[PDB]
PDB file of C-alpha atoms and ligand atoms in Angstrom:
ATOM      1  CA  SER A   1      27.983 -22.034 -22.834  1.00  0.00           C
ATOM      2  CA  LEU A   2      27.833 -18.554 -20.893  1.00  0.00           C
ATOM      3  CA  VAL A   3      25.338 -18.490 -18.053  1.00  0.00           C
ATOM      4  CA  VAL A   4      24.606 -14.853 -17.239  1.00  0.00           C
ATOM      5  CA  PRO A   5      24.893 -14.446 -13.248  1.00  0.00           C
ATOM      6  CA  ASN A   6      21.410 -14.147 -11.768  1.00  0.00           C
ATOM      7  CA  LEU A   7      21.501 -15.247  -8.127  1.00  0.00           C
ATOM      8  CA  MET A   8      20.510 -11.730  -6.647  1.00  0.00           C
ATOM      9  CA  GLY A   9      18.243 -10.726  -9.638  1.00  0.00           C
ATOM     10  CA  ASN A  10      16.069 -13.715  -9.142  1.00  0.00           C
ATOM     11  CA  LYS A  11      15.897 -12.911  -5.399  1.00  0.00           C
ATOM     12  CA  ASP A  12      14.993  -9.253  -6.220  1.00  0.00           C
ATOM     13  CA  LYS A  13      12.284 -10.452  -8.662  1.00  0.00           C
ATOM     14  CA  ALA A  14      10.657 -12.687  -6.229  1.00  0.00           C
ATOM     15  CA  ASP A  15      10.610  -9.933  -3.615  1.00  0.00           C
ATOM     16  CA  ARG A  16       9.174  -7.394  -6.076  1.00  0.00           C
ATOM     17  CA  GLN A  17       6.548 -10.174  -6.840  1.00  0.00           C
ATOM     18  CA  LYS A  18       5.693 -10.171  -3.451  1.00  0.00           C
ATOM     19  CA  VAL A  19       5.519  -6.268  -2.975  1.00  0.00           C
ATOM     20  CA  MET A  20       3.381  -6.119  -5.920  1.00  0.00           C
ATOM     21  CA  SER A  21       0.904  -8.735  -4.945  1.00  0.00           C
ATOM     22  CA  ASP A  22       0.644  -6.790  -1.746  1.00  0.00           C
ATOM     23  CA  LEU A  23      -0.017  -3.522  -3.675  1.00  0.00           C
ATOM     24  CA  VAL A  24      -2.694  -5.174  -5.929  1.00  0.00           C
ATOM     25  CA  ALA A  25      -4.629  -6.485  -2.546  1.00  0.00           C
ATOM     26  CA  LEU A  26      -4.283  -2.899  -0.874  1.00  0.00           C
ATOM     27  CA  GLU A  27      -5.317  -1.271  -4.018  1.00  0.00           C
ATOM     28  CA  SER A  28      -8.597  -3.309  -4.378  1.00  0.00           C
ATOM     29  CA  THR A  29      -9.287  -2.845  -0.502  1.00  0.00           C
ATOM     30  CA  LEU A  30      -8.805   1.136  -1.089  1.00  0.00           C
ATOM     31  CA  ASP A  31     -11.327   0.630  -3.933  1.00  0.00           C
ATOM     32  CA  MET A  32     -14.164  -0.879  -1.505  1.00  0.00           C
ATOM     33  CA  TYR A  33     -13.278   1.864   0.845  1.00  0.00           C
ATOM     34  CA  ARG A  34     -13.979   4.390  -1.808  1.00  0.00           C
ATOM     35  CA  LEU A  35     -17.199   2.533  -2.985  1.00  0.00           C
ATOM     36  CA  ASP A  36     -18.579   3.013   0.432  1.00  0.00           C
ATOM     37  CA  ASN A  37     -16.922   6.518   1.613  1.00  0.00           C
ATOM     38  CA  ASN A  38     -16.563   8.336  -1.760  1.00  0.00           C
ATOM     39  CA  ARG A  39     -12.806   9.041  -1.039  1.00  0.00           C
ATOM     40  CA  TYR A  40      -9.548   7.193  -0.156  1.00  0.00           C
ATOM     41  CA  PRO A  41      -8.049   7.755   3.373  1.00  0.00           C
ATOM     42  CA  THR A  42      -5.835  10.685   3.715  1.00  0.00           C
ATOM     43  CA  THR A  43      -2.193  10.616   4.350  1.00  0.00           C
ATOM     44  CA  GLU A  44      -2.843  10.974   7.959  1.00  0.00           C
ATOM     45  CA  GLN A  45      -5.673   8.390   7.914  1.00  0.00           C
ATOM     46  CA  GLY A  46      -3.239   6.222   6.034  1.00  0.00           C
ATOM     47  CA  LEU A  47      -3.480   2.115   5.139  1.00  0.00           C
ATOM     48  CA  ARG A  48      -4.465   1.852   9.094  1.00  0.00           C
ATOM     49  CA  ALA A  49      -7.984   3.263   7.818  1.00  0.00           C
ATOM     50  CA  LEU A  50      -8.789   0.108   5.995  1.00  0.00           C
ATOM     51  CA  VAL A  51      -8.533  -1.963   9.402  1.00  0.00           C
ATOM     52  CA  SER A  52     -10.595   0.095  11.778  1.00  0.00           C
ATOM     53  CA  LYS A  53     -12.361   3.487  11.385  1.00  0.00           C
ATOM     54  CA  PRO A  54      -9.769   6.480  11.415  1.00  0.00           C
ATOM     55  CA  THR A  55      -9.810   8.844  14.662  1.00  0.00           C
ATOM     56  CA  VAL A  56      -9.241  12.102  12.474  1.00  0.00           C
ATOM     57  CA  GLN A  57     -11.378  14.105   9.706  1.00  0.00           C
ATOM     58  CA  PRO A  58     -12.697  13.530   7.106  1.00  0.00           C
ATOM     59  CA  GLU A  59     -14.596  11.022   9.165  1.00  0.00           C
ATOM     60  CA  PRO A  60     -15.565   8.357   6.438  1.00  0.00           C
ATOM     61  CA  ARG A  61     -19.507   8.386   6.373  1.00  0.00           C
ATOM     62  CA  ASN A  62     -20.268   4.829   5.606  1.00  0.00           C
ATOM     63  CA  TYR A  63     -17.526   2.777   7.241  1.00  0.00           C
ATOM     64  CA  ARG A  64     -18.269  -0.911   7.624  1.00  0.00           C
ATOM     65  CA  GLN A  65     -18.059  -1.940  11.157  1.00  0.00           C
ATOM     66  CA  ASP A  66     -15.959  -4.774  10.340  1.00  0.00           C
ATOM     67  CA  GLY A  67     -13.516  -2.806   8.319  1.00  0.00           C
ATOM     68  CA  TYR A  68     -11.984  -3.484   4.994  1.00  0.00           C
ATOM     69  CA  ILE A  69      -9.134  -5.734   5.762  1.00  0.00           C
ATOM     70  CA  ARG A  70      -8.295  -8.056   8.838  1.00  0.00           C
ATOM     71  CA  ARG A  71      -4.660  -7.252   8.825  1.00  0.00           C
ATOM     72  CA  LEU A  72      -2.253  -5.016   7.108  1.00  0.00           C
ATOM     73  CA  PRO A  73       0.803  -7.033   5.350  1.00  0.00           C
ATOM     74  CA  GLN A  74       4.198  -6.177   6.048  1.00  0.00           C
ATOM     75  CA  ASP A  75       6.794  -6.049   2.983  1.00  0.00           C
ATOM     76  CA  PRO A  76       9.471  -8.766   2.616  1.00  0.00           C
ATOM     77  CA  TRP A  77      11.646  -6.941   4.718  1.00  0.00           C
ATOM     78  CA  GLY A  78       9.367  -6.313   7.830  1.00  0.00           C
ATOM     79  CA  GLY A  79       8.690  -2.876   6.897  1.00  0.00           C
ATOM     80  CA  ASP A  80       5.440  -1.081   6.844  1.00  0.00           C
ATOM     81  CA  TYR A  81       3.522  -0.145   3.492  1.00  0.00           C
ATOM     82  CA  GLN A  82       3.180   3.566   3.043  1.00  0.00           C
ATOM     83  CA  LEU A  83       0.448   5.617   1.426  1.00  0.00           C
ATOM     84  CA  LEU A  84       0.446   9.255  -0.082  1.00  0.00           C
ATOM     85  CA  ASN A  85      -2.930  11.072  -0.802  1.00  0.00           C
ATOM     86  CA  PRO A  86      -2.837  12.748  -3.435  1.00  0.00           C
ATOM     87  CA  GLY A  87      -0.318  10.608  -5.380  1.00  0.00           C
ATOM     88  CA  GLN A  88       2.151  11.891  -7.776  1.00  0.00           C
ATOM     89  CA  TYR A  89       1.263   8.982 -10.338  1.00  0.00           C
ATOM     90  CA  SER A  90      -2.040   7.843  -9.223  1.00  0.00           C
ATOM     91  CA  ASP A  91      -4.914   8.808  -7.091  1.00  0.00           C
ATOM     92  CA  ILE A  92      -2.855   7.476  -4.175  1.00  0.00           C
ATOM     93  CA  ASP A  93       0.778   6.365  -4.221  1.00  0.00           C
ATOM     94  CA  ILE A  94       1.124   3.262  -2.195  1.00  0.00           C
ATOM     95  CA  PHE A  95       4.820   1.778  -1.553  1.00  0.00           C
ATOM     96  CA  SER A  96       6.948  -0.464   0.351  1.00  0.00           C
ATOM     97  CA  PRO A  97      10.140   1.057   1.705  1.00  0.00           C
ATOM     98  CA  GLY A  98      12.190  -1.498   0.044  1.00  0.00           C
ATOM     99  CA  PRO A  99      15.152  -2.848   1.477  1.00  0.00           C
ATOM    100  CA  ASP A 100      16.519   0.099   3.247  1.00  0.00           C
ATOM    101  CA  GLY A 101      13.373   0.227   5.231  1.00  0.00           C
ATOM    102  CA  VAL A 102      13.129   4.318   4.972  1.00  0.00           C
ATOM    103  CA  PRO A 103      10.146   5.792   3.292  1.00  0.00           C
ATOM    104  CA  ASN A 104      11.115   7.987   0.127  1.00  0.00           C
ATOM    105  CA  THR A 105      14.350   6.526  -0.861  1.00  0.00           C
ATOM    106  CA  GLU A 106      15.789   5.110  -3.987  1.00  0.00           C
ATOM    107  CA  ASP A 107      14.904   1.835  -2.496  1.00  0.00           C
ATOM    108  CA  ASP A 108      10.773   2.434  -2.438  1.00  0.00           C
ATOM    109  CA  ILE A 109       8.904  -0.105  -4.469  1.00  0.00           C
ATOM    110  CA  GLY A 110       5.722   1.455  -5.450  1.00  0.00           C
ATOM    111  CA  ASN A 111       2.200   1.164  -7.281  1.00  0.00           C
ATOM    112  CA  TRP A 112       3.373   3.364  -9.857  1.00  0.00           C
ATOM    113  CA  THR A 113       5.423   0.826 -11.385  1.00  0.00           C
ATOM    114  CA  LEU A 114       2.486  -1.500 -11.651  1.00  0.00           C
TER     115      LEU A 114
HETATM  116 CA1  LIG B 201      13.131   3.055   0.805  1.00  0.00          CA
HETATM  117 NA1  LIG B 202     -12.497  -6.068  11.321  1.00  0.00          NA
END
């Protein structure tokens, strides 16, 4: 006879699920980039490197003319996914900035929680 409140918790789980789905897709795309080019994008090159060839070194040596992804997704709050090379927890840390929209805050939802 006691229903635990879950309105926002349920919203949070749905939002986290979209973020994780985006992160998984990005990781797969980053792996295709690495299979071709033998490294992941640098922090400067970023996730944008998956769309078209970066304009800074290290220049990928086997970059598909079509790139690795058609478009970069945004997170559920309209924010941009972030990339750090080298990662603290993985080869590459990839994360949504979360609700607050600021990279590297407590709000970040990252691939280290996959
Ligand atoms: Ca944040
Ligand atoms: Na393309």
